[PDB]
Structures are given as C-alpha cells and as structure tokens.
Amino acid sequence: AESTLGAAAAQSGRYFGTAIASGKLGDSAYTTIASREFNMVTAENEMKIDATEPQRGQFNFSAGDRVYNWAVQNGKQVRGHTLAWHSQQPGWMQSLSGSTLRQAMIDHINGVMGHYKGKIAQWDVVNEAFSDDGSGGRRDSNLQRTGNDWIEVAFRTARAADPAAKLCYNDYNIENWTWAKTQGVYNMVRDFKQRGVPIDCVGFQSHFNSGSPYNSNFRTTLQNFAALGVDVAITELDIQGASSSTYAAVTNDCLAVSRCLGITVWGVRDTDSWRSGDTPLLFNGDGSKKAAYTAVLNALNGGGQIKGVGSGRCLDVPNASTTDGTQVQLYDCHSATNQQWTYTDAGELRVYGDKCLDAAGTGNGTKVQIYSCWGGDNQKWRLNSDGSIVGVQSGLCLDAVGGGTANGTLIQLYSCSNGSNQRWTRT
C-alpha cells in the first residue's frame, strides 16, 4: 500500500518502525496508531541489561516478551536493544570491573540472545561506546576498562549465540561526516571488517536538534559506511520541532543508499517521547498526524497560490484585509498578496507573512479564516498528494461550501469526501 508509513517503506524493500513501551500497550489510542503505521519494533527499555538480568545469572524476559508478542501478533519484525552498554546497568553489574565484568558481559549476551534466538532481525550489540569530547576516542566506562577489545568480544560472542541476526553497532552524533566521533566509528568498523570481526550493520540514532542539527552530508556518511560492506539504519530518529523538510530529507537520504535497511522513529506520539518538550515525532499528543507525517509518507511514496480544481478559483482573503476573524473565500486568481500562501515546515499556511489560515473549531461547517500565527494545531495543515488539505487538529478537509464555484464562495471544514471542492493545486 501507500497510505501507511510501513507499507510505503515496503515499496522500496525497507521498513519504518517505532519504539514501543510495554506500559502503554493497554492504551488503545497508542496501539491503534502503532499497529497500523509501523512494520518494525524496538522495545524502548524492556530489552536493556537491567530489565533482562536483574540479578547476576537470573534472567527475566517478562517485559521484553510482552513487547515481542505484541510485535509478532501484529505482523512486525523486532530490533533487539541493547546487549552491552555503559548506561542503565543493573546495580550488581555496576559493581563489577576487570575480568569479572568481562565474563558477566559475555554471559549476559549469551543469556538474552539464547532466549530470542532466531526471533530478532537486528541486535544493537554494543551501544554508545565512543566519547563526545571531540577526540574521536573510546568513552571511559567500566566496560572499556576491561580492555579495548571488549567491543570485538561482544560481537564475536553475539554471532555464536545467534548467527541468524544482523549485528549492529549503535551510536549518536555520528551522522555528520566531519565530526571526530563519526570518523572514530568509521575506522573501528573498517578495522573490524579487515580482521574478520563479525559486524553486519551500523545504527545511526539520529537524534537531531539545535545543538546537533541534521546536515546534508549525512548521505555521504551513510555511503561511506555502506562502502565498508555493512548495512546501515536510522535507529532512534526524532527531530526537535519536527520540521517537514528535515524529516523528508532524512528519509530521502536512506532511500538514496541501497544498503539503508529502514528507519525507526523513537516513539509514537510527541507525548510518548523522551523529549516531549521538543515535539519531535510524527503524531501529536492527540494521536493526529502532523505535517511532517505527510512529508515522510510522500517521500517514501517517491515524491504561491492555492486554487480549487472544482472551481478553478484561488483561496482568497476578502478585500485583502488583515483583520483576525476574516473568513477566506474563492476568487478569480490574480497575483496579489491576499492570494499568496506560504506553507511552512511547521505546516502552516501563511499570508501577509504573519497571519495564518485558522480553523475556529473542529466540527463540520467550521469557519476557515485568518488569525495571528501562534502555533496551534488548528493553524496546522497537511497537504495530501491527492490534492486535499487536511487540518491537523480536526482531521477535516478544506471545503468550498455547497460545492460553490463562483467568487465569494466561503471555505469551511467538512468531512473529507475527496470531492472536487476539496481538491486544490499549488501554482
């Protein structure tokens, strides 16, 4: 298909997944979206070290299995996250050092992979082993202190435990090619491939924001690692502000690299995010598709004035007034400011620069007007490929009242029927 992210990604042999929290599976609003849109799942915390081995040698897969069962019951594949990591270690392991820690690491890998043997598509075997101090060197942790070869040992151990799973190294801030961290990871992978250390993929977490923005050279970064003979994947994607352009850009970067397996966004709704304050996901708290959602779907599927097809007239602001509450209408198209609409990354349709197409309600017949831009979901719109314009908050379509076609026809919100008075083209 091409109406859901997962199905659209499958059209190019890829997947589109999300992170699932077992504690939210009882929320039908959560699961409805999750089961429908994604075909790949990562347990947000259920498969971490502290959750799977609470006490040394005593494994517990109850939380992890709830996530796994849900995934398979709903036709999704699973990424295992994560086997060796300096963070979120259970108390007993934090107390270990030297050879004792090294063996415990090995035992943990064998224990967790044995339970899920043959059931996991990808495993983040080692997570975040590199430093952020700009040296491009290893992060200092109890694991690194057991010996520089700890990462290699983790991978060799993993391959023996379950040779059916793809083994990935996973990290953040390794997307921009110019960073020392990115290059430090590249050299490690190169070394591993030349010495025969088993590693099949590199996961780029892809947590983008103002302090660590997406950069177009990310595509060369992906190509460079791919050239080493490993697959690559975007594993924990989220973008501060959820810019439609940036979300579409990241998607196209993966689509340009044959070795890019797929994309996983780190969560379902903004409110489920570990960084909810940054509204970095594709669905808002209400479970509504955001503007970025449409941008991603359109990219996966291959992808001024606004005139209605059924009337041939343009979206117009009466008498070119700038008064809040002025309802918009259809009118003879002519290059005039009151007919110039700018679609922003946030999904707004701006006029006069600071006025926004505004929905004064969420029900059928709601008046569509202009109002000072402030960022509300009632000022957010999704421009579907079928030519329809849907309001993020209401889920309703821009509709020319009564199918009218003459000048003065008013614009409202109405159930989407894909009628001709609901289709628009940008010129």
Ligand X SMILES: OC[C@H]1O[C@@H](O)[C@H](O)[C@@H](O)[C@H]1O
Residues that bind ligand X (CB under 6 A): 316, 318-320, 331, 336, 338, 399, 401-403, 414, 417, 419, 421
- Choice from 23, 98, 363, 375 touching a second copy (CB under 8 A): 375
Question: Which DSSP string do the residues of 277-303 spell out, in sequence order?
Answer: GG--SSB-TTSPBPHHHHHHHHHHTT-
331 interface partner picked from a second copy, ligand X, none, CB below 5 to 8 A per type: ligand X
| Residue 287 or 419 having the CB closest to ligand X | 419
**Measured from the CB of residue 334, what is the shortest distance to ligand X in angstroms?**
7
- Which position has the token pair 């992979």? 113
Residue 105: is it exposed, middle or buried by C-beta count within 10 angstroms (0-12/13-18/19+)? buried
H or E stretch at 391: strand 389-391
What residue 353 binds from ligand X, a second copy, none (CB within 5 to 8 A, per partner kind)?
a second copy
Among positions 111, 198, 241, 387, the unique one binding a second copy when judged by CB under 8 A: 241
The neighbour count for residue 147, using CB atoms within 10 Å, is 13
- Tell me whether residue 112 or residue 239 sits nearer to a second copy (CB atom): 239
On whether 329 is known to bind a ligand per the annotation, the reply is yes
CA 70 to chain centre: 20
344 forms part of the interface with a second copy (CB under 8 A): yes
Q: Is 363 in the site for a second copy (CB under 8 A)?
A: no
Tell me if 282 contacts a second copy by CB under 8 A: no
Confirm or reject binding of residue 243 to a second copy (CB under 8 A): yes
Binding segment (CB under 8 A) for a second copy, from list 93-101, 160-168, 342-350, 417-425: 342-350
Q: What type of residue is 138?
A: R
Q: Among residues 147 and 213, whose Cβ is nearest to a second copy?
A: 213
- Looking at residue 381, the DSSP 8-state letter turns out to be E
242 belongs to the binding site for a second copy (CB under 8 A) = yes
Q: Quick one: residue 343, left, alpha or beta (phi over 0 = left, psi -120 to 50 = alpha)?
A: beta
Nearest distance from C-beta of residue 306 to a second copy, angstroms: 17
**Which CB, 194 or 319, lies closer to ligand X?**
319
- Give rounded-to-5 percent helix, strand, coil for the chain: 35, 25, 45
Residue 169 main-chain phi, psi, to 5 deg: -105, 140
- Find the binder of a second copy among 91, 148, 194, 354 (CB under 8 A): 354
**Shortest separation between residue 324's beta carbon and ligand X, angstroms:** 17
Catalytic residue of the set 53, 152, 236, 348: 236
Query: Any contact of residue 136 with a second copy (CB under 8 A)?
Result: no
* Interface pick for a second copy out of 95, 245, 321, 364 (rule CB under 8 A): 245
Query: CA-CA distances (angstroms) from residue 325 to 365, 381, 399?
Result: 15, 18, 18
Task: Assess contact for 202 and 189: CB atoms under 8 A.
Answer: yes
344 binds, among a second copy, ligand X, none (CB under 5 to 8 A by kind): a second copy
CB-wise, 315 or 346, nearer to a second copy?
346
CA gap 266, 274 in Å, rounded: 8
Site track for a second copy across 139-178, x = CB under 8 A: ----------------------------------------
Nearest by Cα to 300 from 268, 274, 338, 262: 262
**Closest to 345 in 3D by CA, of 294, 269, 285:** 294
Read off φ and ψ for residue 194, nearest 5 degrees.
-75, -30
Task: Write the burial class of residue 1 (CB in 10 Å: 0-12 exposed, 13-18 middle, 19+ buried).
Answer: exposed
173 binds, among a second copy, ligand X, none (CB under 5 to 8 A by kind): none
Compute how many other C-beta atoms are within 10 angstroms of the C-beta atom of residue 249. Answer: 18
Q: Is 218 in the site for a second copy (CB under 8 A)?
A: no
Residue with tokens 């004064």: 360
- Does 34 carry a binding-site annotation? no
- Clarify whether 2 is annotated catalytic: no
Could you give the residue numbers annotated as active site?
Answer: 236
**Binding-site positions for beta-D-galactose:** 316, 319, 329, 334, 338, 399-400, 402-403, 421
Q: Tell me which residues touch a second copy (CB under 8 A).
A: 210-211, 213-216, 240-243, 245-246, 278-279, 323-325, 342, 344-346, 353-354, 358-361, 369, 371-376, 378
